Design a protein around this nucleic acid. Structure first.
Ligand SMILES: [K+]
Ligand SMILES: [K+]
Ligand SMILES: [K+]
Ligand SMILES: [K+]
Ligand SMILES: [Mg+2]
Ligand SMILES: [Mg+2]
Ligand SMILES: [Mg+2]
Ligand SMILES: [Mg+2]
Ligand SMILES: [Mg+2]
Ligand SMILES: [Mg+2]
Ligand SMILES: [Mg+2]
Ligand SMILES: [Mg+2]
Ligand SMILES: [Mg+2]
Ligand SMILES: [Mg+2]
Ligand SMILES: [Mg+2]
Ligand SMILES: [Mg+2]
Ligand SMILES: [Mg+2]
Ligand SMILES: [Mg+2]
Ligand SMILES: [Mg+2]
Ligand SMILES: [Mg+2]
Ligand SMILES: [Mg+2]
Ligand SMILES: [Mg+2]
Ligand SMILES: [Mg+2]
Ligand SMILES: [Mg+2]
Ligand SMILES: [Mg+2]
Ligand SMILES: [Zn+2]
Lengths: 201, 307, 98, 46, 183
RNA sequence: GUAUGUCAAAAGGGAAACAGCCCAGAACAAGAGUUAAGGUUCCAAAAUUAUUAUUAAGUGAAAUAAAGAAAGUUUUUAUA
RNA sequence: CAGGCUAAUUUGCGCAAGAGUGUACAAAAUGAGUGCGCGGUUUGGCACCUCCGGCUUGACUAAUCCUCAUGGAUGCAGAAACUAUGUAGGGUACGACUGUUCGUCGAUUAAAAAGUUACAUGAGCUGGGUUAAAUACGUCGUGAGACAGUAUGGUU
RNA sequence: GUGCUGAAAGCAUAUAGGCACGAAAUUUACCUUAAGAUAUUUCUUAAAUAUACGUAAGAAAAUAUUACGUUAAUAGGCUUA
């Protein structure tokens, strides 16, 4: 992969900690493949993932860089996870330092949004609940997963924040699942600059 | 196989050796998995045994007229508790009525001897959700066990109808009456296809046979009246069986359990009406050993004529 | 048809091995007869015809040992085990191009 | 969506992908097109 | 007739063998190199070896009529090895003779109810002769999901070392050397 | 109709079961005898025997469903 | 007659290709004459085997009339409907006409869809059609008589 | 059918890998029958128990099933409402 070769510039403040090849015994499997626990701690938080053992990280603390490599480029399994493991570390490094954000735009007459607390259905103490008026008879209320900070600068604009991109973009898709953009009036929830082509009439 | 997908012998007992604490996946079958899938629908409290006394109507003070059945509780007592560590499921055994000692057998005479309860007429188990549903042994359950407006389920044995035909047993339409029919006015007709359908009567074919005298449940029957003195619990609707038959009454499974406050109030009333249900039980269990040890030795006659 | 003649369209690795040994055994019968005559300075017209227009098992293509030419087939080829008495009959040459 | 036995790209934006393939089924071949939704096609039957 | 005149007691005795469905088997594995790639015995390749033990065909006194089989304790059946996508694509069918009542279930759904031991009993069952000894032989297959079983004292031993243990082979060679000190 | 064979009047081994196909012509026994067709993980006598490639679909494994489609994969031949 | 083999044929379907229709624009819908197939429902072929509807009671199939989820729809504003992908759990009624399956019609309905099983089921029933002896009409035959012609009746 | 992350393939991609939504079908749940492990600080040393017989029945073609048999309201009679 042409992306796995590119070094990963570790900006000041971020710290990458590579574990050791370990195997969690699984009674359902006769042989588990070793993995490596990689922690990426920094100002905003800490993210952890387990990479296959065939991926080798040359963590250069001097130049603050870390290049990836596989034990065999001829195997399809190792070529794929090489680039996928790089794309994840890139997000982790750029998520714990700067952070990931998603913007949702509510188009449609009568579409509002507020961030209130619903102590009745709190999954964890202090859970924030996004309350959305989307034209349904009932109120649509969703609790932000633990680790995300949601705010609404304007009634028709939501701003999600978090260090885990996969979690942030996944939670923005659940909110969008209630009102998918329509092609006749543009009403719906658009995520991160998403647009829809309109019809003539 | 013999039953299901299991080819395991019938005398093998390997359950204790396949544990989830050893890293194995929780089985989908077995007592543990059964109780989880029925956790929501299992009642929280126990039930009572009542005798169907007849049918009537409940007249409201504003014009209402509601058909209902009168179920009388006769000396209903808690006889035993079934724990999950000793039996595999939660349940409470309840008794009804009385019986003459001579009719009761020695196996059952000693069963009640170790409890301090007079021999009962019938016994039945009522499954409960968890250990909180177990009650002290020897406490009587009165009609106030339920509250007016509470929905329950009534289980009873239907009226026996002997050998029934096809019309009464399976609602077969029958055949014509006068347009040429020969000897086939109430018969079942054809019983299947020919060679292409197996050359045999197919299993599960609806045919004449005995009808009735089987258990039937009526679900979601409210409680209109609750009278402790009369000992009756009036429920709306009909109930299976004949008058004088024993039925099982318990909270509905398809409805939310009664309020938490009620479940505690009823349990708190059993501690007042019977302030000592354990002291009388431990004394009975202490006497059973003394008499059981005398029967073994053969000196029971001395104890009988001791005073 | 309703009468079942369950003959597979292809041969097994066992039938192919014995077919190779039956072709190679008929090569030794023709070489033994041809060498025994050469010592006496004699020749047979049938032995000279065979060596001319018939190949040996080592000169045959895999498709010529296990298949024959049938004009009623999609690709003008038919399993050699479909020939009557194929085990005791000689068959090594097919029309050119097919 | 049009379920054909011969799926073909109808523009430069059409892509050939094999989706719904998992441990229980082999999946189908799809012609996904973000420009025109009328180019959606599938090969195979459930 | 001399060869069979003697004490046949121990030739007909039931031996309690043991095997783990997770331990790599260099003999019953199709991957024989490298050492780290040697897999355990597959379902059908383990079942074919077990059916041979249940029939007593590994003995020189085997007779199909006499039930000279042995016991086999198979452990770690939860990690039963399988290739391809058998676990989620193989189906087990059942019929009770009543039209409509065909019951199908996948290998993974059959391992959630009765564990991997049932999948192994079905394989060994179909590899046994279809006769009046099929249920007796299949009953001597005691398969368990984990490492725990009630036959840890029944397993055949040699000098205190259970067969298949780390040092069972050396314990056997030490007993036969003393056997040679006799006429 | 023709050519050839079998059955008919031919048992036995193989083709799951089999009048007609592949082997082979049964007077009767004995044998880890020697072989044909066919086969050798288990049912079930005999290889879980060796060498090199392909397939990941249980395709297939003793009765080939077609034209056709396609960033499935391998190899060869050009070519950047 | 039914079963068996076959599949020209069909009132049973599918896929490939795309003349053309669609104001525009091939594939929303539509699809000439064709090609490659599946299937065993119609009308047939062969000659291996043995010298009709209705009622009652089912079972199964899915190529779907309704009900549930859903893609496409210059031709999806909504609603209704069209086309297609999942899906056979339940339902698919009543009446007039005809011996009728079929077909036509009336009025309701969410809808009033099909097929296999000896075109399921007559040692379960019905016998109206069909199918003997009687009799008449028409037609044919010199005549006795005949008729995939029609009528009344005719031991299930 | 609809998604998030995301490479092989710098792009793209709900294709590999890691997660998710989603139907009157399925499974569970609900009801009946069958199954009969198990439980009781249960009984029994020639018994426990069951049957037979008699009055019956919530049972009923036979059978079976559920009660009772004088220390007894099982059936009939009688008395009252
Ligand atoms: K009559
Ligand atoms: K029969
Ligand atoms: K994407
Ligand atoms: K139940
Ligand atoms: Mg009665
Ligand atoms: Mg009637
Ligand atoms: Mg049969
Ligand atoms: Mg046949
Ligand atoms: Mg898809
Ligand atoms: Mg003759
Ligand atoms: Mg023969
Ligand atoms: Mg075979
Ligand atoms: Mg030999
Ligand atoms: Mg063998
Ligand atoms: Mg196959
Ligand atoms: Mg749409
Ligand atoms: Mg359902
Ligand atoms: Mg018929
Ligand atoms: Mg008949
Ligand atoms: Mg008359
Ligand atoms: Mg990407
Ligand atoms: Mg005891
Ligand atoms: Mg006695
Ligand atoms: Mg009687
Ligand atoms: Mg009286
Ligand atoms: Zn396109």
């Amino acid at each position: 992969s042409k992306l796995g070769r590119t070094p990963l510039s570790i900006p000041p403040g971020v710290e990458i900690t590579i574990g050791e090849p370990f195997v969690k015994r699984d009674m359902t499997q006769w042989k588990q493949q070793p993995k490596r626990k990689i922690t990426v701690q920094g100002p905003l938080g800490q993210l952890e993932m387990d990479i296959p053992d065939f991926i080798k990280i040359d963590h250069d603390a001097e130049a603050r860089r870390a290049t990836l490599s596989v034990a065999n480029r001829d195997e399809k399994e190792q070529r794929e996870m090489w680039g996928t493991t790089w794309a994840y570390l890139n997000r982790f490094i750029m998520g714990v330092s700067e952070g990931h954000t998603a913007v949702l735009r509510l188009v449609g007459i009568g579409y509002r949004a507020t961030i209130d607390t619903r102590p009745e259905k709190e999954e964890y103490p202090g859970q924030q609940f996004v309350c959305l008026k989307l034209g349904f008879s009932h109120p649509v209320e969703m609790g932000v997963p633990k680790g995300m900070k949601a705010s609404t600068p304007q009634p028709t604009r939501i701003l999600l924040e978090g260090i885990n991109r996969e979690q942030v973009m996944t939670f923005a898709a659940d909110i969008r699942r209630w009102r998918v953009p329509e092609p006749y009036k543009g009403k719906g929830i658009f995520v991160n600059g998403e647009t829809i082509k309109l019809k003539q009439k | 196989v013999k039953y299901g997908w299991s080819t395991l012998p019938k005398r093998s007992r390997p359950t204790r050796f396949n544990q989830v604490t050893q890293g194995l996946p929780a089985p989908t079958s077995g007592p543990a998995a059964a109780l989880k899938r029925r956790e929501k629908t299992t009642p929280l409290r126990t039930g009572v045994l009542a005798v169907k006394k007849g049918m009537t109507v409940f007249m409201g003070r504003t014009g209402a007229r509601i058909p209902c059945t009168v179920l009388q509780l006769d000396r209903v007592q808690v006889v035993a508790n079934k724990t999950r560590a000793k039996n595999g499921y939660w349940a409470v055994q309840v008794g009804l009525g009385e019986r003459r000692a001579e009719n009761v057998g020695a196996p059952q005479l000693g069963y009640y001897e170790a409890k301090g309860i007079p021999p009962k007429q019938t016994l039945a188990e009522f499954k409960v959700r968890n250990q909180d549903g177990l009650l002290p042994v020897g406490v009587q359950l009165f009609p106030d066990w339920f509250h007016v407006g509470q929905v329950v389920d009534v289980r009873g044995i239907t009226r026996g109808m002997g050998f029934a035909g096809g019309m009464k047993r399976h609602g077969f339409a029958g055949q014509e009456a006068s347009h040429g029919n020969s000897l086939n006015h109430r018969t079942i007709g054809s019983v299947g296809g020919s060679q292409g359908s197996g050359s045999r009567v197919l299993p599960g074919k609806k045919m004449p046979g005995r009808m009735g005298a089987q258990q039937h449940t009526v679900q979601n029957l409210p409680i209109l009246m609750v009278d402790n003195e009369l000992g009756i619990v009036v429920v709306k609707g009909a109930v299976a069986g004949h008058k004088g038959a024993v039925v099982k009454v318990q909270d509905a499974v398809k409805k939310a359990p009664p309020p938490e406050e009620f479940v505690e109030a009823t349990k708190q009333l059993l501690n007042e009406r019977f302030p000592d249900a354990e002291e009388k039980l431990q004394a009975a269990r202490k006497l059973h050993l003394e008499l059981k040890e005398a029967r073994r030795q053969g000196l029971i006659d001395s104890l009988i004529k001791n005073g | 048809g309703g009468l079942l003649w369950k003959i597979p369209w292809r041969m097994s690795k066992f039938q192919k091995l014995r077919q190779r040994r039956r072709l190679r055994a008929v090569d030794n019968v023709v070489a033994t007869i041809e060498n025994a005559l050469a010592k006496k300075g004699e020749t047979v017209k049938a032995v000279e015809r065979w060596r001319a227009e018939m190949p040996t098992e080592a000169e045959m293509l895999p498709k010529d040992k296990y298949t024959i030419f049938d004009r009623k087939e999609k690709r003008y080829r038919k399993g050699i085990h479909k020939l009557p008495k194929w085990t005791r009959v000689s068959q090594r040459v097919n029309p050119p191009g097919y | 969506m049009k379920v054909h036995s011969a799926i073909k790209k109808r523009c430069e934006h059409c892509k050939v992908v094999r989706r719904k393939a998992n441990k229980r089924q082999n999946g189908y071949l799809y012609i996904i097109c973000p420009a025109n939704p009328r180019h959606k096609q599938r090969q195979g039957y459930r | 007739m001399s060869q069979t005149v003697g004490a046949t007691r121990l030739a007909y005795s039931r031996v309690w063998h043991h095997i783990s469905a997770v331990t790599p088997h260099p003999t019953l594995s199709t991957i024989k190199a490298p050492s780290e790639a040697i897999t355990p015995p597959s379902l059908g390749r383990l079942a074919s070896r077990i059916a041979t033990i249940l029939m007593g065909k590994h003995k020189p006194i085997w007779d199909p009529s006499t039930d000279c089989g042995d016991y086999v304790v198979v452990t770690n059946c939860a990690g039963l090895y399988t290739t391809g996508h058998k676990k989620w694509r193989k189906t087990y069918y059942r019929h009770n003779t009543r039209p409509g009542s065909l019951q199908a279930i996948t290998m993974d759904a059959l391992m959630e109810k009765h564990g991997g031991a049932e999948v192994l009993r079905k394989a060994v069952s179909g590899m046994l002769p279809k006769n009046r000894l099929r249920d007796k032989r299949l009953a001597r297959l005691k398969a368990f999901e984990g490492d725990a079983h009630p036959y840890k004292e029944n397993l055949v031993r040699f000098g205190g070392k259970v067969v298949g243990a780390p040092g069972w082979e050396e314990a056997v060679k030490a007993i036969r050397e003393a056997d040679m000190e006799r006429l």
